[PDB]
Amino acid sequence: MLSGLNHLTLAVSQLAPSVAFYQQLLGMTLHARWDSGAYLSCGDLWLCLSLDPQRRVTPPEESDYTHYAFSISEADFASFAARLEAAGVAVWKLNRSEGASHYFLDPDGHKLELHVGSLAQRLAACREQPYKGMVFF
Amino acid sequence: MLSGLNHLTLAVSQLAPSVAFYQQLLGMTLHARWDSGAYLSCGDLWLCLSLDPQRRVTPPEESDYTHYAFSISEADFASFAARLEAAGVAVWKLNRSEGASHYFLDPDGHKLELHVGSLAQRLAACREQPYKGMVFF
Ligand SMILES: CCNC(=O)CSc1nnc(C(C)C)o1
Ligand SMILES: [Mn+2]
Ligand SMILES: [Mn+2]
16 A cells, blocks of 8 residues: 655756755755765655766756656745745746645756645635536545 | 745646646545646645646656655655656656665656655765755855
8 A cells, every 4th residue: 555755856967056056045954965976854755866977957848747746835825936046046937727826946857846735725716716627526 | 035935836738647646646636627638635735736738748868857756654665666667758857866765757747756855864965975066054
């Protein structure tokens, strides 16, 4: 039986700028780094950054919709998003199709998101404003 | 302040086989489905499958090391790996690290892993046998 996400591993092209992005800019906790990677946590999430010569800096129009959303409180959401904007962090999406979200890119173009709300809250919102053809189980 | 992973969204080329893989083969709970996606849970993980015509069925040699690991107990690991093997699910890597790991591909080539063990367990092993250049914080 699978019980959740054990870890998220992101391939990165340049380790130090990626560590700085996740630790300094996003505020995650850095636990260890080595010549080819780093381990961070964000709450319960174990994030691994893995130096990969295959990773390319990818513009958002070249990648699919696969993305990683991080939880933030309603009280903190807007000022965190505005700080990322003021820091020049690139974006990839503007239309809020899944609630209160801010869509931004990491240095390699990994698609990230700040989101306010749980799955239960999103299901409740969708009952009122459902996506086309939506069925609830 | 970011408090954890809010959700993981995977772009999928065909919704029905992806729902079958995550719900039926991998045992995740299907909460909702609409014409262009689905919401599932796996423990605390909120997973979204998003139908995306830009998703390519991608051979593992053509994607980088970015991957998504799910937690499973040691006791359940071998029978779950055998289930994936019976279903013909391809493996993209052999395990050479601490903690059991099974590295397998989803229908679109998303790189997945079953892993036994926490960040704390990994850090303890690393303290005893540090990787090249390893620093702790
Ligand atoms: C399947 C259950 N997992 C999730 O809903 C992850 S997002 C999530 N979980 N708690 C929260 C807070 C905003 C209350 O947000
Ligand atoms: Mn999202
Ligand atoms: Mn892994």
